[PDB]
Design an enzyme around this catalytic site. Structure first.
Site, PDB file in Angstrom:
ATOM      1  N   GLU B  58      29.698  40.667  59.200  1.00 46.89           N
ATOM      2  CA  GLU B  58      30.741  39.646  59.296  1.00 46.89           C
ATOM      3  C   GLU B  58      30.911  39.077  60.713  1.00 46.89           C
ATOM      4  O   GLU B  58      31.018  37.859  60.874  1.00 46.89           O
ATOM      5  CB  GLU B  58      32.086  40.184  58.787  1.00 46.89           C
ATOM      6  CG  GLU B  58      33.243  39.193  58.937  1.00 46.89           C
ATOM      7  CD  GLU B  58      34.529  39.673  58.286  1.00 46.89           C
ATOM      8  OE1 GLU B  58      34.851  40.865  58.428  1.00 46.89           O
ATOM      9  OE2 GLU B  58      35.229  38.868  57.638  1.00 46.89           O
ATOM     10  N   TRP B  80      33.825  38.360  51.024  1.00 50.69           N
ATOM     11  CA  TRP B  80      34.395  37.015  50.977  1.00 50.69           C
ATOM     12  C   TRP B  80      34.197  36.288  49.632  1.00 50.69           C
ATOM     13  O   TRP B  80      34.676  35.167  49.466  1.00 50.69           O
ATOM     14  CB  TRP B  80      33.846  36.143  52.131  1.00 50.69           C
ATOM     15  CG  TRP B  80      34.498  36.406  53.491  1.00 50.69           C
ATOM     16  CD1 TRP B  80      34.114  37.337  54.426  1.00 50.69           C
ATOM     17  CD2 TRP B  80      35.686  35.788  54.016  1.00 50.69           C
ATOM     18  NE1 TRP B  80      34.986  37.336  55.486  1.00 50.69           N
ATOM     19  CE2 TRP B  80      35.959  36.397  55.264  1.00 50.69           C
ATOM     20  CE3 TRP B  80      36.542  34.780  53.552  1.00 50.69           C
ATOM     21  CZ2 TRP B  80      37.067  36.028  56.055  1.00 50.69           C
ATOM     22  CZ3 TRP B  80      37.635  34.415  54.333  1.00 50.69           C
ATOM     23  CH2 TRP B  80      37.886  35.038  55.574  1.00 50.69           C
ATOM     24  N   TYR B  94      37.773  31.180  60.146  1.00 52.24           N
ATOM     25  CA  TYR B  94      37.504  31.735  61.479  1.00 52.24           C
ATOM     26  C   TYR B  94      36.404  31.108  62.343  1.00 52.24           C
ATOM     27  O   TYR B  94      36.692  30.368  63.279  1.00 52.24           O
ATOM     28  CB  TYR B  94      37.244  33.241  61.360  1.00 52.24           C
ATOM     29  CG  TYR B  94      38.424  34.010  60.820  1.00 52.24           C
ATOM     30  CD1 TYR B  94      39.550  34.243  61.610  1.00 52.24           C
ATOM     31  CD2 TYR B  94      38.427  34.490  59.505  1.00 52.24           C
ATOM     32  CE1 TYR B  94      40.648  34.937  61.107  1.00 52.24           C
ATOM     33  CE2 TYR B  94      39.517  35.184  58.994  1.00 52.24           C
ATOM     34  CZ  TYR B  94      40.626  35.406  59.797  1.00 52.24           C
ATOM     35  OH  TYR B  94      41.710  36.100  59.302  1.00 52.24           O
ATOM     36  N   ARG B 127      44.872  32.916  81.067  1.00 51.45           N
ATOM     37  CA  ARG B 127      44.771  32.113  79.862  1.00 51.45           C
ATOM     38  C   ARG B 127      43.367  32.135  79.232  1.00 51.45           C
ATOM     39  O   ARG B 127      42.841  31.114  78.795  1.00 51.45           O
ATOM     40  CB  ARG B 127      45.213  30.684  80.180  1.00 51.45           C
ATOM     41  CG  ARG B 127      44.793  30.225  81.559  1.00 51.45           C
ATOM     42  CD  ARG B 127      45.167  28.778  81.802  1.00 51.45           C
ATOM     43  NE  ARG B 127      44.630  27.890  80.780  1.00 51.45           N
ATOM     44  CZ  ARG B 127      44.665  26.561  80.847  1.00 51.45           C
ATOM     45  NH1 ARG B 127      45.192  25.958  81.905  1.00 51.45           N
ATOM     46  NH2 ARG B 127      44.158  25.830  79.861  1.00 51.45           N
ATOM     47  N   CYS B 146      44.595  35.857  59.454  1.00 52.85           N
ATOM     48  CA  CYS B 146      45.419  37.043  59.509  1.00 52.85           C
ATOM     49  C   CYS B 146      45.290  37.558  60.924  1.00 52.85           C
ATOM     50  O   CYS B 146      46.293  37.848  61.583  1.00 52.85           O
ATOM     51  CB  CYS B 146      44.968  38.089  58.485  1.00 52.85           C
ATOM     52  SG  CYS B 146      45.005  37.497  56.731  1.00 52.85           S
ATOM     53  N   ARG B 166      49.294  38.820  62.151  1.00 49.65           N
ATOM     54  CA  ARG B 166      50.525  38.441  61.452  1.00 49.65           C
ATOM     55  C   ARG B 166      50.881  39.243  60.183  1.00 49.65           C
ATOM     56  O   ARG B 166      52.080  39.478  59.914  1.00 49.65           O
ATOM     57  CB  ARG B 166      50.480  36.965  61.074  1.00 49.65           C
ATOM     58  CG  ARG B 166      49.535  36.669  59.923  1.00 49.65           C
ATOM     59  CD  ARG B 166      49.630  35.248  59.433  1.00 49.65           C
ATOM     60  NE  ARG B 166      48.576  34.905  58.481  1.00 49.65           N
ATOM     61  CZ  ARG B 166      48.716  34.905  57.160  1.00 49.65           C
ATOM     62  NH1 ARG B 166      49.882  35.221  56.608  1.00 49.65           N
ATOM     63  NH2 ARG B 166      47.686  34.570  56.392  1.00 49.65           N
ATOM     64  N   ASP B 169      47.629  45.175  55.816  1.00 51.30           N
ATOM     65  CA  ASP B 169      47.589  46.197  54.813  1.00 51.30           C
ATOM     66  C   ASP B 169      47.194  47.449  55.582  1.00 51.30           C
ATOM     67  O   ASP B 169      46.038  47.573  55.983  1.00 51.30           O
ATOM     68  CB  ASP B 169      46.523  45.867  53.795  1.00 51.30           C
ATOM     69  CG  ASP B 169      46.513  46.814  52.656  1.00 51.30           C
ATOM     70  OD1 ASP B 169      46.652  48.034  52.909  1.00 51.30           O
ATOM     71  OD2 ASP B 169      46.368  46.368  51.498  1.00 51.30           O
TER      72      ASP B 169
END
Lengths: 264, 264
Positions: B58, B80, B94, B127, B146, B166, B169
């Site tokens: 991934e 996916w 992403y 930054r 996520c 955010r 699980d």
């Protein structure tokens, strides 16, 4: 406040040496998190004297989405002067991304209005988020977002909020920053018929400037006193209708004010 | 791992009841933060058996910026599938925001390439950030980010990274999620001639599903063992040239695997 003094002490004990935007030295740490139960009083620092006059004016400015400093100038607020240009413009900073984020197809997104709809119609959502970090528009801003992103949350009739702060001056800016969002949660709750919960603070490169050391040792030697209490005299028809005089603090009794000299 | 079990226990003690995307019940908490000193070993959970085969595939997929699942399908990766459409497309998820964020004026921003330039030429910047939360393109995605945002940091020849998650699980996804970024910091350091530092995890609505309770009580009763060690057999000419076989784990000795049933 009990929690603000500990960060200070932790920076002194675990901080590493280095510099900033190429100027004054600092001691810094990466990664920190604290919590403030809003039910235990307004989190306005009592170990030094502070004011909410500029804090209030700036917020109502953010909410209206304008980015020119006229309104701040009418009321004698001068914190954004340093970065403003000749016409009083600052580029597409906070308020602009908050109320009209430009898309690649022709629209402007009102994130604040979106956020109230969610808490009001689908309070258990896991994506009630507001962002100001718009990659495509950084180079046009006079200053890249510091309080860059925040999320809301509901449980047992209480509203909570978590903010991500990428850069933070512990001595000069942290106090200003905390009461600012603390105020927003309150205003958000009133318009959502809800009680206030927790305000969660998360930071990154958190630091103290070397020419603030004496001032820091001094604050660390005074005992924190009871937090005051926020009073909202009116109930606006919406989040865009609040006025300066709607707010009032009670029971605030700080120690004496301390200055913060900066280099140029 | 010592730190993963505590979150689990804290959710059980302080979690409140409620639901998810309208389905199964959960116990949840808002706001958490943990730290993993990468120098003390790869943070791959030993209290249950896990694999890095899908995790590796991934990541190399994210880095290449494509969002169609062909590559994942050639190699038999099926995580996916659930969200993909008929042509195997998932929208601008992403990898797309990571390598070509669309601006309102006609360009595509390569955030990964920007990030390496910074650590390499201006390591003290505050930054060095990568975001995937592109407001203007959420409605076109098959799934809103996520692991939405992360920042990098340098001090005493060590690279550190903090991620904001955010939604999480704890039982089914947390393990996968932690080793994934843990791997990236490593790959980032090698290409930046630097030693690895800390990996800081920050979350929001962190939860456990009710039909995972038994499985949770079981993991909490097994003793954690020594973390294994990551080995990188090759040194690619850049961050876009890594191959599956470049990685290898050592000293991994987990307890037995446990299943996670989900509702539909």
């Amino acid at each position: 406040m009990k929690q603000y003094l500990e960060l200070m002490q932790k920076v002194l004990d675990e901080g590493t040496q280095k510099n900033d935007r190429t100027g004054t030295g600092t001691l810094s740490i990466f990664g920190h998190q604290m919590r403030f139960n809003l039910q235990d009083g307004f989190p306005l620092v009592t170990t030094k004297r502070c004011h909410l006059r500029s804090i209030i004016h700036e917020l109502l400015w953010f909410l209206q989405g304008d980015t020119n400093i006229a309104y701040l100038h009418e009321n004698n607020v001068t914190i954004w002067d340093e970065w403003a240009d000749e016409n009083g413009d600052l580029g597409p900073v906070y308020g602009k991304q908050w109320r009209a984020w430009p898309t690649p197809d022709g629209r402007h997104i009102d994130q604040i209005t979106t956020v109230l709809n969610q808490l009001k119609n689908d309070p258990d959502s896991r994506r009630i988020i507001v962002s100001a970090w718009n990659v495509g528009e950084l180079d046009k801003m006079a200053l890249a977002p510091c309080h860059a992103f925040f999320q809301f949350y509901v449980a047992d009739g209480k509203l909570s909020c978590q903010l991500y702060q990428r850069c933070c001056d512990v001595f000069l800016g942290l106090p200003f920053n905390i009461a600012s969002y603390a105020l927003l949660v309150h205003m958000m709750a009133q318009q959502c018929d809800l009680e206030v919960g927790d305000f969660v603070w998360t930071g990154g490169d958190t630091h103290l400037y070397s020419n603030h050391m004496d001032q820091t040792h001094l604050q660390l030697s005074r005992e924190p006193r009871p937090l005051p209490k926020l009073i909202i005299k009116r109930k606006p028809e919406s989040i865009f209708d609040y006025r300066f005089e709607d707010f009032e603090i009670e029971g605030y009794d700080p120690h004496p004010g301390i200055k913060a000299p900066v280099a140029i």
